[PDB]
Amino acid sequence: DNIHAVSSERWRIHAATEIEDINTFFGTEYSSEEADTIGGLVIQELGHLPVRGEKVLIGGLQFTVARADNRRLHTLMATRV
Amino acid sequence: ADNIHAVSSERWRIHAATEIEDINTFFGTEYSSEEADTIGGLVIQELGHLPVRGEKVLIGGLQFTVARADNRRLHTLMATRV
Amino acid sequence: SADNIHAVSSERWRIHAATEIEDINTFFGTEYSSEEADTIGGLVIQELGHLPVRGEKVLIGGLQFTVARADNRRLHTLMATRVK
Amino acid sequence: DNIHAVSSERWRIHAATEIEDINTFFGTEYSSEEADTIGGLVIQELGHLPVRGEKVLIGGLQFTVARADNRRLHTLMATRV
Ligand SMILES: [Zn+2]
Ligand SMILES: [Zn+2]
Ligand SMILES: [Zn+2]
Ligand SMILES: [Zn+2]
Ligand SMILES: [Zn+2]
Ligand SMILES: [Zn+2]
Ligand SMILES: [Zn+2]
Ligand SMILES: [Zn+2]
Ligand SMILES: [Zn+2]
Ligand SMILES: [Zn+2]
Numbered sequence: 001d002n003i004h005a006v007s008s009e010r011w012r013i014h015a016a017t018e019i020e021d022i023n024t025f026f027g028t029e030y031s032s033e034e035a036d037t038i039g040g041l042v043i044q045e046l047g048h049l050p051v052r053g054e055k056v057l058i059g060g061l062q063f064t065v066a067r068a069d070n071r072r073l074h075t076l077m078a079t080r081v
Numbered sequence: 082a083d084n085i086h087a088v089s090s091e092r093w094r095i096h097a098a099t100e101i102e103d104i105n106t107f108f109g110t111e112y113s114s115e116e117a118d119t120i121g122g123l124v125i126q127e128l129g130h131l132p133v134r135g136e137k138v139l140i141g142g143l144q145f146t147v148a149r150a151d152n153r154r155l156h157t158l159m160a161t162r163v
Numbered sequence: 164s165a166d167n168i169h170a171v172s173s174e175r176w177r178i179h180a181a182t183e184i185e186d187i188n189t190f191f192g193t194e195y196s197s198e199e200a201d202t203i204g205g206l207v208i209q210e211l212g213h214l215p216v217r218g219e220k221v222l223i224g225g226l227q228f229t230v231a232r233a234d235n236r237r238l239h240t241l242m243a244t245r246v247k
Numbered sequence: 248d249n250i251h252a253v254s255s256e257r258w259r260i261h262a263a264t265e266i267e268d269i270n271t272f273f274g275t276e277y278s279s280e281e282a283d284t285i286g287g288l289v290i291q292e293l294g295h296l297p298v299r300g301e302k303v304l305i306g307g308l309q310f311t312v313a314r315a316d317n318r319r320l321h322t323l324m325a326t327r328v
């Protein structure tokens with residue numbers, strides 16, 4: 001699973017998860033104009049490839065970077081605001 | 082290999098064999114039973130019989146709906162918050 | 164049991180191959196990571212180079228994984244112990 | 248499973264677990280001369296019915312009380328000393 005529930009209000013999410021799938025899962029309306037994937041959306045929002053422990057708020061969800069390297073973002077943790 | 086599957090952010094598909102303590106960790110609930118060790122066991126206790134698909138049990142601020150069950154086993158519950 | 168990582172005794176575990184690598188890491192305190200694998204079965208296949216048969220073993224970090232159930236399609240179950 | 252691994256070195260144990268079963272799983276040599284369940288043995292070693300958080304070292308395992316009430320001990324967490 002690309003979106004894994006760690007607990008009822010916390011999700012471990014592969015960066016490659018399609019934005020469409022995030023939107024269906026969460027009831028969000030994130031745009032896919034500038035990205036295909038949630039990792040891509042996070043990078044677009046921050047303007048820069050983030051580091052482990054960095055958090056970004058997008059709509060009503062907070063994404064925390066769980067695993068990233070100098071090349072790629074691989075995993076995010078999400079919770080509600 | 083996941084026992085509690087989130088189908089959407091507010092809805093979960095749960096294996097009936099999932100241990101009650103693991104349900105409690107996941108949801109913050111405090112379920113207990115001296116007759117059952119699994120969430121399926123608890124649902125059977127509450128309903129007083131082996132249920133069929135569509136039967137519902139409300140406990141501890143969660144609603145469990147029987148998603149799959151036959152004449153021998155209760156397999157799967159769907160949970161939502163009340 | 165319903166455990167994806169099932170202790171058969173205090174120091175030996177039967178593990179569903181489909182267990183996510185992150186859930187292995189939480190359980191064991193390992194820091195496994197793959198660019199190309201998301202599950203422990205995937206990681207075993209990566210480290211061995213091929214789909215293994217029952218009885219094949221691989222050491223990854225401080226854990227030894229032996230194949231317990233596999234077929235011509237899939238690796239299903241592993242038995243793990245801590246390296247000595 | 249009356250003895251469930253939460254993590255590789257921490258186990259959730261039903262208080263009603265027979266002492267013999269503890270011995271099989273851990274290689275302990277606890278005896279059943281008085282209590283014959285692990286919850287009974289914890290109470291016997293402490294000398295009273297414990298509350299959540301109480302710990303007793305028995306041989307090479309530490310048992311911490313995880314769920315108890317004013318009448319019964321239900322769940323223990325074990326770790327190695
Ligand atoms: Zn998962
Ligand atoms: Zn929409
Ligand atoms: Zn990478
Ligand atoms: Zn399932
Ligand atoms: Zn239990
Ligand atoms: Zn019925
Ligand atoms: Zn069946
Ligand atoms: Zn077993
Ligand atoms: Zn994953
Ligand atoms: Zn081979």
Ligand SMILES: [Zn+2]
Nearest residue numbers: 164166248251
């Ligand atoms: Zn278990």
Ligand SMILES: [Zn+2]
Nearest residue numbers: 293295297301
């Ligand atoms: Zn005391």
Ligand SMILES: [Zn+2]
Nearest residue numbers: 115319320321
């Ligand atoms: Zn009890």
